[PDB]
Design a protein around this nucleic acid. Structure first.
Lengths: 107, 107
RNA sequence: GGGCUUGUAGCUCAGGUGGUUAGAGCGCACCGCGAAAGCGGUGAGGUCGGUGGUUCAAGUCCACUCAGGCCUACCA
RNA sequence: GGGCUUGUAGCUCAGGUGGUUAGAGCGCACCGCGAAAGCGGUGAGGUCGGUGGUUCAAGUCCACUCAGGCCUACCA
C-alpha cells in the first residue's frame, strides 16, 4: 500500500536533544523525557525502559515525531513520540549520523 | 498543524543496508544506491553527493521510507528515499543508535 | 544535455555483402493511336545535402558538419 | 491500582476546627379551629454506620473497619 510524497510531508520528523530522563513509578516499561527542539521544549513518554537506562539517554540527539496530537500516558502528557527500530532481538533509538543542531528537520 | 497516529502509520520507515553507491553521470548532486532490506533490495536516488562520497556510505545502515510510489530521476527508477537532516550548515543521514538487522521497522 | 532515423531526377522512391549497379513510376518535350479515361515510341532531366579521410575501387565504410522527423535527461 | 468525599429521628438535613450544642423542616399520633386549601397546641421518634484509642471533656480528634457517591492510573 504505497503513498505519495504528500502523505509523508504531513509528518514532522525532527532531531531533539535529551535534557532529562527518568523512570515512571509503577510502570515496568516507561520513561519520561524532557527534550529540547532548539526553540522549545517537549515532554515525551517512551516505552523503552527495558532496553535503555535513563542515564545513557541524557545528552543524546534522537529523532522524534513532533506534530502528533498529545496523549496522556500514566497521567503524563506526551507531546510527541520517540522513534525506535526493532528486529525481534535488539531495540534501538534513532540518531543523526553526523552532529546537527537540535530542531533540524528531516526530509 | 497536528496529526493523528493513523496519519503516521501510513508511512513505512525501515533500516536499510547500503550495498553499493555511485555518482550519477551528468548530475551535480545525485548518488544512485542499492539497499538491502533483508529479504529484498531497493534502488534509490539521493541528492547528497555534495556531503557524502560513495565510499563512506557503503556498508552503512540508514533510515529510509520504503513505501513511496517510485519516481524516475535521471533515468533511474527510485523506489524510496533516504532521510536526511540539515540545520543550515551540515547535512546528515539517519542511522540506528545500536546495531539492528536490516529491514527493521521503525515505530 | 544524450540518442535514433531520413536526406539520390521536378515529385514519391530503388540501389543486399564497397566493384555487378545510379535506375523505376508519375510528370515534362516531340511523334503516332484513341470517343474519352488512356496507350505505344523516341528523348531530356542527377553538387547521390556539404567537407575531410580510408581503400586498387565509395551513393555504399569512418569522422566532422547542415537540415527535417522522433525518443529521452534537466538534480527525493 | 491511586485518591477525594458522605454516613446523625421514618425522609431531607443543622451541629466551622472538642465543652456553648444532639436539633430543624416535612411526615406520623392525639386534641382543637376552618366551608375548603390549611392552621394552632401537645407528643413519639437517636448503637450520631461498627470497633479500639486520645483527653478533665468526643457526633466532633487519631487508627482500624463496613457501606454509598465521585475523580484518576491500567504501558507511544
Amino acid at each position: 500500500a504505497l503513498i505519495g510524497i504528500e502523505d509523508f510531508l504531513k509528518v514532522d520528523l525532527r532531531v531533539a536533544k535529551v535534557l532529562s530522563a527518568e523512570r515512571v513509578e509503577g510502570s515496568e516499561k516507561l520513561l519520561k523525557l524532557t527534550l529540547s527542539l532548539g526553540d522549545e521544549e517537549r515532554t515525551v513518554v517512551a516505552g523503552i525502559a527495558k532496553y535503555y537506562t535513563p542515564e545513557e539517554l541524557v545528552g543524546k540527539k534522537i529523532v522524534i515525531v513532533a506534530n502528533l496530537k498529545p496523549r496522556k500516558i500514566f497521567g503524563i502528557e506526551s507531546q510527541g513520540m520517540i522513534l525506535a527500530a526493532s528486529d525481534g532481538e535488539n531495540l534501538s533509538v534513532i540518531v543523526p549520523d553526523r552532529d546537527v543542531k537540535e530542531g533540524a528537520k528531516l526530509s
